[PDB]
Design a protein around this ligand. Sequence first.
Ligand SMILES: Nc1nc2c(ncn2[C@@H]2O[C@H](COP(=O)(O)OP(=O)(O)OP(=O)(O)O)[C@@H](O)[C@H]2O)c(=O)[nH]1
Ligand SMILES: Nc1nc2c(ncn2[C@@H]2O[C@H](COP(=O)(O)OP(=O)(O)OP(=O)(O)O)[C@@H](O)[C@H]2O)c(=O)[nH]1
Ligand SMILES: Nc1nc2c(ncn2[C@@H]2O[C@H](COP(=O)(O)OP(=O)(O)O)[C@@H](O)[C@H]2O)c(=O)[nH]1
Ligand SMILES: Nc1nc2c(ncn2[C@@H]2O[C@H](COP(=O)(O)OP(=O)(O)O)[C@@H](O)[C@H]2O)c(=O)[nH]1
Ligand SMILES: [Mg+2]
Ligand SMILES: [Mg+2]
Lengths: 93, 426, 426, 96, 427, 427
Amino acid sequence: AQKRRMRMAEHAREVQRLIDEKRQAFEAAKAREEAEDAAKRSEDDRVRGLVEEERKKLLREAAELKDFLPRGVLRDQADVDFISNVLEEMALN
Amino acid sequence: MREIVHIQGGQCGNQIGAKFWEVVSDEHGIDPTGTYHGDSDLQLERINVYFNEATGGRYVPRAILMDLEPGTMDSVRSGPYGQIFRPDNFVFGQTGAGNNWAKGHYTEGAELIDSVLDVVRKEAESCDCLQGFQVCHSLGGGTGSGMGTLLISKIREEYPDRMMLTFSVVPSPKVSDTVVEPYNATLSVHQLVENADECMVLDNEALYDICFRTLKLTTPTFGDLNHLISAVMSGITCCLRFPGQLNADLRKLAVNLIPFPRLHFFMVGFTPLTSRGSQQYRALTVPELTQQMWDAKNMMCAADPRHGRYLTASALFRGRMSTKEVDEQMLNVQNKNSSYFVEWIPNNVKSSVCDIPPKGLKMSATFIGNSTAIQEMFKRVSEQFTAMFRRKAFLHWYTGEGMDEMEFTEAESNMNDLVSEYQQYQ
Amino acid sequence: MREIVHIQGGQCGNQIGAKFWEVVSDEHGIDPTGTYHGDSDLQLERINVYFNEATGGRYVPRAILMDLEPGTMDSVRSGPYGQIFRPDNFVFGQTGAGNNWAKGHYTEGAELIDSVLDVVRKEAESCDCLQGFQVCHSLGGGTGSGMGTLLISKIREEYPDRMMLTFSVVPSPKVSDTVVEPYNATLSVHQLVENADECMVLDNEALYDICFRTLKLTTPTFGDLNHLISAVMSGITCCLRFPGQLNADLRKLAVNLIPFPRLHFFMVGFTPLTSRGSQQYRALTVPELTQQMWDAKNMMCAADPRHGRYLTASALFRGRMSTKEVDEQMLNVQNKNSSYFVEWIPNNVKSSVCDIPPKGLKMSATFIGNSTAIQEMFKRVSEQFTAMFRRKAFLHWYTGEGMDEMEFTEAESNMNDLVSEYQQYQ
Amino acid sequence: GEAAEPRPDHKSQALTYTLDQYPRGRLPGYTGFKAQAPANIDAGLKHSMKLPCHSTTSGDATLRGTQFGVPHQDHTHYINSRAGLNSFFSNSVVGT
Amino acid sequence: REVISIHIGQAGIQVGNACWELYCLEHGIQPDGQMPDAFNTFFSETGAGKHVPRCIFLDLEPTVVDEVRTGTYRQLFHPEQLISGKEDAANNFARGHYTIGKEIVDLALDRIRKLADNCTGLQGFLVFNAVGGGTGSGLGSLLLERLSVDYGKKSKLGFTVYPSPQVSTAVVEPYNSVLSTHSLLEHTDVAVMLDNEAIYDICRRSLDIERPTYTNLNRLIAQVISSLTASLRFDGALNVDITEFQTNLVPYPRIHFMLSSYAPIISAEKAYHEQLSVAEITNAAFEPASMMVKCDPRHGKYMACCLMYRGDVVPKDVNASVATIKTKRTIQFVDWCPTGFKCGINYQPPTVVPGGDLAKVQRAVCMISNSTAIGEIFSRLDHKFDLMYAKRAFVHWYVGEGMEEGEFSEAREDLAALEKDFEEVGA
Amino acid sequence: REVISIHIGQAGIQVGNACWELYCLEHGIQPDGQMPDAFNTFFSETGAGKHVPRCIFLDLEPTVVDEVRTGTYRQLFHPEQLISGKEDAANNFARGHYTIGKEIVDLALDRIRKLADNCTGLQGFLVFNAVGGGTGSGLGSLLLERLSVDYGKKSKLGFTVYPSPQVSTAVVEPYNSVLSTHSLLEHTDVAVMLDNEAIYDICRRSLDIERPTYTNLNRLIAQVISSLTASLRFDGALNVDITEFQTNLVPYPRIHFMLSSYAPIISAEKAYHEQLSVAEITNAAFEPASMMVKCDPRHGKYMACCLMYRGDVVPKDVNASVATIKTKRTIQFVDWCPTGFKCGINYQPPTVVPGGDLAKVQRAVCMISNSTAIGEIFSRLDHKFDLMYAKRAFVHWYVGEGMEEGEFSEAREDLAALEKDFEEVGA
Ligand SMILES: Nc1nc2c(ncn2[C@@H]2O[C@H](COP(=O)(O)OP(=O)(O)OP(=O)(O)O)[C@@H](O)[C@H]2O)c(=O)[nH]1
Ligand SMILES: Nc1nc2c(ncn2[C@@H]2O[C@H](COP(=O)(O)OP(=O)(O)OP(=O)(O)O)[C@@H](O)[C@H]2O)c(=O)[nH]1
Ligand SMILES: Nc1nc2c(ncn2[C@@H]2O[C@H](COP(=O)(O)OP(=O)(O)O)[C@@H](O)[C@H]2O)c(=O)[nH]1
Ligand SMILES: Nc1nc2c(ncn2[C@@H]2O[C@H](COP(=O)(O)OP(=O)(O)O)[C@@H](O)[C@H]2O)c(=O)[nH]1
Ligand SMILES: [Mg+2]
Ligand SMILES: [Mg+2]
């Protein structure tokens, strides 16, 4: 009785401690992938920051010829605000 | 270890090589200033295949720019990743050929190819175990075709054991820039069939169609076209640079796709290619990549593959993927499109898997089909060549330089016997 | 597992489908941007039927928009839940049919329908087990009727073993929006009885009567009509998306309601439908739903059923209900009004329950009756067709395009034998 | 350049999630949505309902049945083969 | 001794969902599958501290199946057993009998084969299906056919749900009932009918539940099955096996259709105000207010009856009560069966499941009888079958699947022959 | 007692990369090399607290070998053992047998010699190779023939990977498989086939893994190898050495090609739910749903069978189970062997790997049989070899490498002779 019962108990314990490790392994792998994803996303956002500053510089140098302009160069109202700000800065200059 | 020497010829070759070394440098994570800045260990162990550590971490490409006009060199040097080449590798004549195959193969090569051979030799014994050479040039230009073809001949004369890739673009009548396209392309093909090991044929017509249909670009400049071709070349040699669950080097692909020694002209396709507005509206699965691969509207030649049969085909996959899905998809395409394949060769699909995806993507694929639909393109050229040569148009620009009429007749003969033997195996 | 591909044609189909996907996404808890924001686990089990995960929580609807003028496309992209459709699923012509069934079926169909077939083909092979198709269109217009009906014919000869629902609004004299309504309706019904599995007739007159009496709305714009139609479509396919005590799939409803292959025109109703002013004084039990279901002023067609006889009928209940109460209620409603039912079919009412109510209510229902009174609507349209066709009015715009006269005589003959056999079984 | 720490074996590390061979407690049948995307995966663990719930009647009945558990019973009239018939046959003489 | 129970169709596995619930709640097994010997007939013990039921739920629409795969008993049931198709038969006998059956039943057979091989003292099978549907009728009969050709000599207890006369949910169920009965005749050894209108009336009057769903129906049906297998699980003063109904209840190899009943169906409050003894429940087992099939035995004559008794029951009063029944004349037997009863006594009372409305009774009776009112039911079904058939209604669906008129005509005349058989044995 | 293992080709060392991982996990050896006598047959104990395996990896492409050199098992393998050339053979038997073999084989066998001199009680060699490739085939065959001339008498177990019929990754693999077999006939002693499609089907069907990769394949191949050498490693009730397969399964000097199988291949949930015993796994190890080679032995007749039982096994029930197999008629034997079995029992159960998918089982069975279904396989490969050789396709690679049509035609007729042999013996 004792031998067989303790063998069954030990086997249940080992199976449980195995299932938990498999689950934890999945958790760890998913977390690692998520870290990689966050890294790539942050990198792309950083690149977008630079492209936005460059667009701002182009708009600053375009502010001078305000009256002669094509149809769409203002992406949004905030861009209109920026162009008016640089216009007033030119007026100050 | 295994070494790939790069050789670029002509204006097309130079600008193609510029975008190529741009994307390889991004893959290995080296900055435009030449220093390593990558993250993974994997990017360190296989940069000797393409670079040489000089001193202070300067990794210079193992490439040789070659042309006859400095305009292309300056366009290369102007953009970023232009100051990473060794200026000793800028072997460069001074007169300029200008769309004359006789100039690029008899007059100017006689004083330039010696210096090119010196540079490519010194660049060859600088590394230990050569895998082969890799040439990017055109068949419409003069200094690209003629000089590059003569260089191919001299190299195959000296080093007969190393492999040889040639990415050559062919002219198309729908996108026809120069007038002597047939006169140049026919003579170049005549020499490529006997000297080169395999030629991966490209063209601009199919590229423009791809960016119209799939990419939906508004202004497809040469930058995007060179971007696609570079993505092709990185895909074809990802196996050496990165470990995978099944590796396939250059010679391995050559023996799996060339059933006959003169049957070595491939058509290429690259996947995935999707518009930016729809890039997030799609899945990324192996069946999805395979549907985009085997679409006839995705080959990089102006030859509809459904007008002929594939002799062999190859698919190099990049990314962490399940091999079972890889082979079952290959089995599906070998069974569903069963008529489009040759009968006297079962298992016409070679496959390979690399474990590192290209930068920015999760999983990509490269298709290299050796089909018999390429004879349509050679007939599409040879009919123009015969139209002129029946009538000695423009012939004196070549006659008065040393080239005789027998060269043109021989080029007609080899073109015709090639398309006839492709027609035979169809 | 079981899959429903959705197809919207013409202006009526696009606007109705727009409100349809709004109701569906709100039931499945997906926000208009395209990410999951629901709570219940029941909502995740059955989104493979209507959506595909692309990457990163983005669920794209399995729908195809098909028209000829971009005005409907912009009305689709402007409203909420508009940015979710795949842009490749916007297959789309440019010219415009404009109330010409010949333009919808012979000239523009020959270049648009191969394209939409390829999109539908791709969308069908993307899934595993097709249950059926769901097509919403109109019968008065040209770009909806003729184009959609040809699409039905092509699909029915392509996948013959799959179900197909079609929701079509039909013309009425009191709601006469276009002038060639009979010339379009008669040809469309002629083709639908031979291709479509079953149709659910709709019209604007009954919807306006519903908004007048039951809803008591002040300004019933098209948004509210499409809202009612959307509620019905969600109600019928609720069974595939949610479990219940007695599941009844699309095919199970078809075989329970269609005694003969040509008698597949149903009239539809929806409950509960009360004004917000009276929602406070009302009760919500099965008898209160039934005595609003079987009322003639709740059918969404202009066919008074008490002027005919019911062949079969079906009720789809949603919400935690007691089936004894449901069934004894069906028995009582069949015994009381015993004359209005056919006699040689016992147990004329099929009933089914699902254990998920729609959002905003505790318990709802959907009535689908296959009555014989629909021959009044067909007789009403065929008499207008005769009045025009005896005198060759408006005919030459159809004749001069490729259509001939015997097509019209054929449509007359088939409508006449159709109303003859409805009257026969009555 | 100096590999002080050995490479972490990506070929085995990719199996459990990147190819999604590990099932998040799902039976070998159960044709349903797999949610093969990270945002949906992490949102699935925040589901309030968690499968069986008081919403569907078929689940709610079984839940109300197992609410209390197995209270108590007497095993007098339960038929015991262990008493009479399995007692005739014994295990190995030496012991196993 | 062991018996395996298979469930086919939407109603089958829902009843099983209540059935196995009651079983584990009787034998003290947690819903996860381990105890906190009488289970041996239903649950086989894998390893130690783990029990897996001898059953296979199978159906074609996966909705109700994966509802089970994801209910409370995910761990209790075993993964391979719960077979699921890909699409539904949709109230179409032919679609379930020829199209999809040919792919799914061979998997069911070589599954059930290794279930039998894992079993040791197999008493028989017992199948649960509703003939109104397409799955339970079509491939159910297909499975019974191939089971008969596989084993044959082993009993097959068929507890089927027949459609009610007036309360009905489907419209093609007369077609499905006739076609299924055509094969249930020569395959099923002992087939018990379980209607819905009768149970509805039981829940309405006795259980005083005015809004009952399918849950309460399946619960008390599961209660009857447990009361019927109690003799195999437990020891009593006089027990029967599953082969006993084979001999004691079937006089002719084609008259096997039994009327079932149970008593006392008593709520939790009426019992406190009422007295329980053997004589009144032996009476109450015969009145149609306690039957599971809407019919009138006053119009018919009984062939043979069976009486399972559970709980604190002595044999003297069951003997005296059946004596009073035989000497009474409100009910009459046939002239060819002088002794028309089959009694059986078991010690254990019926346990209750929490959430149900059945009281804890000291004793209970499960009656399984044979009569000719079933001949009246079959005639009433065949009449309304012929009404729809005279106009060839709905036939195009079956012939579109691949069937013809021959099996309709032969099934129609088969039930006519069964009608004549019932009338000639009744005389 | 010692046995050394060599690994050839791209597939070989990936198999070894999973197999040695299993050995260290079985003997409790940490990957750095030290335990925190049964191990002696695989690890030799250098220094103090350090065991270094009796293995050799060798390949022509250095990319996968130095992937091992940088992997987790840096310190475990002697730096010299891992042989690696300069450049790949590239799916070319002639290139990997005549041009590059001539410089690599001498370094290999002049290593293996000093490995054998380190050893004392060498049972034999066991080779891991895939014949489809160029490296696995060319210098594989070259190594085998130079080992046979060096030792001769010692057994050489060859675990080869043949290409699937319909699943294929290469194109010239028929040429390579035929040219490799032409020497595998008369050089190796005991050769076990294992395919990839059969394993894909196994992992999809039983293991319910819908997207498997090569790693899962290599994991259960290691299970098979470990299960057939565990008799040497651990003491069982009835042990079996490597010389036994040499006699008990090879009745003819040129008929040595053994099908392999394994049971129970089982997932994590199904295993706990079901009741594993000896009878059902003895059955399951005989169905083609669990063989490592895609072929149906129902078409063939078993020449000999060998059954390794691991774990929870008494000899009685295995004896009874093989009896039921012999008296069944679903499979038949040749008329030549009345005693067509060889059993073998070991006590230690099979171990599990974290990240592996197979649950722990009390007992497992690895069957190694011999039949004529392999005779069907070779004819299948011979058909599509003659298809490509009729058109002289791809031949210019081999001749320009240095070979001729002579060995092409003679390997063709060699497989023809083997075909006549199998057809003659099967009668
Ligand atoms: N007593 C009882 N009867 C049920 C239950 N569920 C369904 N039924 C009956 O089953 C009959 C129809 O067959 P179903 O089981 O519902 O469906 P099916 O047999 O699986 O056939 P399909 O609908 O094609 O799947 C209906 O008339 C119901 O009366 C239930 O839970 N309890
Ligand atoms: N089962 C299994 N088969 C493999 C594995 N790796 C490669 N193969 C098989 O090997 C065959 C090709 O040979 P490879 O091992 O890839 O390459 P090789 O044998 O070393 O020959 P070379 O490519 O010239 O180096 C393919 O058909 C694969 O099926 C693996 O990890 N597991
Ligand atoms: N795709 C692509 N094609 C190019 C590019 N530059 C030139 N070409 C093609 O090359 C052909 C002319 O070759 P050319 O530059 O004159 O060669 P070269 O004179 O010998 O150097 C034209 O048909 C162009 O289409 C480029 O950057 N990208
Ligand atoms: N209820 C409703 N009906 C509409 C809507 N748009 C158009 N219709 C109906 O469509 C009919 C005319 O068909 P039409 O829209 O011209 O079809 P099309 O031109 O082929 O797209 C009219 O009778 C309208 O009642 C809408 O948004 N809601
Ligand atoms: Mg059902
Ligand atoms: Mg290899």
